[PDB]
């Protein structure tokens, strides 16, 4: 890869009966192991649960 790779994300889900969709966009340093991203809830917002449960999926 190169030392600053961009990425894009789509997410669909249901948590406790609540349907939602998210998009994400970011970049990071693949070999240095650092990254940043922005996530937007595009359906089912405002999220009716802690976003923290979605963190490891992003």
């Amino acid at each position: 890869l190169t030392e600053t790779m961009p990425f894009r994300m789509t997410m669909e889900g249901t948590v406790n009966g609540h349907h939602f969709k998210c998009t994400g966009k970011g970049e990071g340093n693949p070999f240095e192991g650092t990254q940043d991203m922005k996530i937007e809830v595009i359906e089912g917002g405002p999220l009716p649960f802690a976003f923290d449960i979605l963190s490891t999926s992003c």
Binding site: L1, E12, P30, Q35, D36, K38, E40, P46, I53, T56
Partner: protein, 166 residues
């Protein structure tokens, strides 16, 4: 986003090796108060862009708990153990969600990482650890978030072997 890991000590990189074909991961996270969060993720390389596709099913979160009440304070840093099972890579980790009053809510992550490459093209890593830090900012309530992560894959150097293990 397992492509962004700093590997040390000559540990092979299962995820970066997987390109151009990419990889998938699958996980169930079990929460100590009864909640479950299950995910499947597809990772692909499209030109100069990594593309993530995620499916999520969460259930049984207590109505009164910090998750459904939206009173969570982010994750503590965490340690994942990784090792070969059935010719793929398995990951296991405990995480701790910060709660109001200096409390924590723990959970266990059960992960299988699956290269889309044949085994013949891959160097499987030995048992190792991955240190994770995830930090989140809520930019707009329930709508816009920023997430930062740092990850490092390593052996246990902090507590060394008198017998010459990793």
């Amino acid at each position: 986003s397992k492509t962004f890991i700093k590997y040390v000590s000559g540990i092979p990189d299962y995820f970066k090796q997987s390109f151009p074909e990419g990889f998938t991961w699958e996980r169930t996270t079990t929460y100590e108060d009864g909640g479950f969060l299950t995910a499947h993720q597809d990772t692909s390389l499209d030109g100069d862009c990594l593309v993530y596709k995620v499916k999520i099913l969460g259930n049984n979160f207590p109505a009164d708990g910090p998750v459904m009440q939206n009173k969570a304070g982010g994750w503590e840093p965490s340690c994942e153990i990784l090792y070969e099972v059935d010719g793929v890579l398995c990951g296991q980790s405990l995480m701790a969600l910060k709660c109001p009053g200096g409390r924590h809510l723990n959970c266990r992550l059960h992960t299988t990482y699956r290269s889309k490459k044949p085994a013949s093209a891959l160097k499987m890593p030995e048992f190792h650890f991955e240190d994770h830090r995830i930090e989140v900012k809520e930019v707009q309530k329930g709508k816009h978030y920023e997430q930062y992560e740092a990850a490092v894959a390593r052996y246990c150097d902090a507590a060394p072997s008198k017998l010459g293990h990793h």
